[PDB]
Design a protein around this ligand. Sequence first.
Ligand code: NAD
Ligand code: NAD
Ligand code: FE
Ligand code: FE
Lengths: 384, 384
Amino acid sequence: ANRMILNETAWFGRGAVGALTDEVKRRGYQKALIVTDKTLVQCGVVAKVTDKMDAAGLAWAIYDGVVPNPTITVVKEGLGVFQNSGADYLIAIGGGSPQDTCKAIGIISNNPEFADVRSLEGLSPTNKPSVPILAIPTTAGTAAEVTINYVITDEEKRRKFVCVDPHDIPQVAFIDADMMDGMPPALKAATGVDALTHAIEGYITRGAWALTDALHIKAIEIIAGALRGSVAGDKDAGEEMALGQYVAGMGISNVGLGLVHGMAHPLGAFYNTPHGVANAILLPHVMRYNADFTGEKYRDIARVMGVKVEGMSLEEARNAAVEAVFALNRDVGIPPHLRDVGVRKEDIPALAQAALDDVCTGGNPREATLEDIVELYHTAWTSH
Amino acid sequence: ANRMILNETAWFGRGAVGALTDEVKRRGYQKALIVTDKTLVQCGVVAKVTDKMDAAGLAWAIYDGVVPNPTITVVKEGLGVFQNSGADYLIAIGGGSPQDTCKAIGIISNNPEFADVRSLEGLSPTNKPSVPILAIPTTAGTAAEVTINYVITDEEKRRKFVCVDPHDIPQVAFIDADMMDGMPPALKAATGVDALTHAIEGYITRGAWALTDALHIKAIEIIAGALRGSVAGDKDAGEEMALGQYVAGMGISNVGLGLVHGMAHPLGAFYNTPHGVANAILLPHVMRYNADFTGEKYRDIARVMGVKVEGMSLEEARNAAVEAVFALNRDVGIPPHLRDVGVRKEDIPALAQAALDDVCTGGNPREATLEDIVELYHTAWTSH
Ligand SMILES: NC(=O)c1ccc[n+]([C@@H]2O[C@H](COP(=O)([O-])OP(=O)(O)OC[C@H]3O[C@@H](n4cnc5c(N)ncnc54)[C@H](O)[C@@H]3O)[C@@H](O)[C@H]2O)c1
Ligand SMILES: NC(=O)c1ccc[n+]([C@@H]2O[C@H](COP(=O)([O-])OP(=O)(O)OC[C@H]3O[C@@H](n4cnc5c(N)ncnc54)[C@H](O)[C@@H]3O)[C@@H](O)[C@H]2O)c1
Ligand SMILES: [Fe+3]
Ligand SMILES: [Fe+3]
């Protein structure tokens, strides 16, 4: 049988964060710790929520120390602020980095033996649910609000590790494009192709089944239809992206991903490469590698990305799907090569071993070898 | 903004009830009350679960007093059995009648001021979550495992009332076609068209939006593809129906239904008409009434029900969608007219007023008048 874990409650649309004060009152919570980053404070995104909490008389404290690719140090620091805050629940405001930090803090607070953080890797053997989390994404996005995963950087071991735990699922997600509009265009582009990567990898993952296929192919259609417009500042395209990125995540931890996420993680660990950019650059190269092991599915991807697939051979349809992703990447300004974002050719074998061992790689529809992954990093790296 | 309430956890596929004992152990529950009916006990469906609970050392008691269109008496009796059982959680085994009884018992147990049952009608202002519910459907089906609705019969007032409450959502749903295979063919047919009715009414309801549209049109495709095969005894078609009926419900408590459910409820109240049969007979007539208020949506319905819509006008595609439902109803043996199932012509004005006032009718895409509903009952009552 197949398990699906989802948010019990989610609010969607512009103004969805307007539901937060009523949700808090209905659940009887007394005081939030907001887990966020300095950019979202500076840009006034956090205040979109705290102004509503202030108006409703709801108490809050803030931890804004999160950094991209959040580290063991960031988790321990946030946990310290949580323990001293008197908060009884968490509000995660931000992209995957704050949402994942918030999950780690919530889990460790109710499972204090995991305070070393390393011990959470894999199927975390936690006995207690997380401190309740209300999740408010500000990128479009990682869908960290709806997965049971969170990804922490071990700086000493130079690796990103995935923690998988039904105990971390947020109680309520608020998916509000008003919270996302202020992303710089390059951040809309990269988080949007990360969303597309979740949807494509989820569509073709070894564990795929009927329900996740239906969700993923709809997410691909929405994201491919909306991302150019959203990057360009179209308000309705932004609302479409907010929905598409969420639907794209409804399979990440229910069925799995593949070698794109497997190869993106070591770039985050080695260089602090932004997750979205890493996935975007890799995606079409990994799609080419996987193409002949994905049945009819690239014909479906090409069709919903606007390709006229009528009369194409399966290989022509596969080539068209890959080309549609290369074209979208160019069209929203994704750097074309890993050399452009400071990846070092001499690191490729170490990156490839880290990718081969990444849990995401296990879902890949083509069984990857070390040599295959080395060649893929070279293909993605090269100016030629 | 649009709210989605879903099961936090759901297991899908033949053998999904095999997950139940581990879910109970992980949640630390001590003793179940199983809420079911005498038929499911007698035919050994309940033992499929209790044999597994016995093997795992999990305590249970049973209330099997549920009858179709469960009444205030059934709820009060089951509440009494629950209170005396020492159970700390509920397991609902059955179709909508046991699932809805279980929701009422769980809500009242934690919100004892609603012990009159009538007071639960509408948006129940309960302060506390239900006693935890694990939901196991045996029909395909009402999707009562995933909606926030439950429907109780007031025998004294001769009316069915709808209770809508986020607090009643089951913690875990187990969607297992092994639990459904014993439905007689006529029961597969009627519960299957009830599922189709959820999916069609949910697709065209006033509150419809992008996510529920995606779920409902996929549910229509699955159900229209599988129902004839499932009624004929095909095991794989039965598993398809188990998924389709669930997806059909993911939309409905989140966006609403329409006049088919509004007109079906008074038939259940007046005559004890089976819910699925009532919906099936009404569905194509109400679809014809609603057709010109549904934009392009009947072209989508006709297409996924196997109609070649290429080259049809929208009005031709609307007619084709209605005809596809008439054809399905004939093919799975739904009685063609309300007179066939003991509906009295002289009751039509009283039925019509009850339907006009039913909360489901408020979602109908065409604003219904008393006169319109009277005419629709007449159209459905005999051949013209
Ligand atoms: N299942 C999961 O939990 C899951 C899924 C995939 C990714 N991840 C993790 O998510 C992280 C990446 O998250 P991300 O891609 O959302 O980026 P991020 O959270 O790392 O943020 C990237 C940058 O964008 C800024 N930013 C975010 N929202 C903004 C806004 N609205 N306006 C202005 N600036 C804004 C941040 O301040 C930061 O500088 C990685 O660590 C990745 O491994 C986890
Ligand atoms: N909760 C909601 O959102 C919701 C939605 C729709 C319908 N409903 C309600 O659900 C009820 C109808 O439920 P239903 O249509 O599932 O039927 P049901 O639960 O009333 O059962 C009908 C008959 O089928 C039998 N049966 C059920 N499963 C069987 C199996 N596997 N093998 C053999 N016999 C089996 C029952 O014992 C009974 O005799 C109505 O009261 C309706 O109002 C509620
Ligand atoms: Fe990602
Ligand atoms: Fe129904």
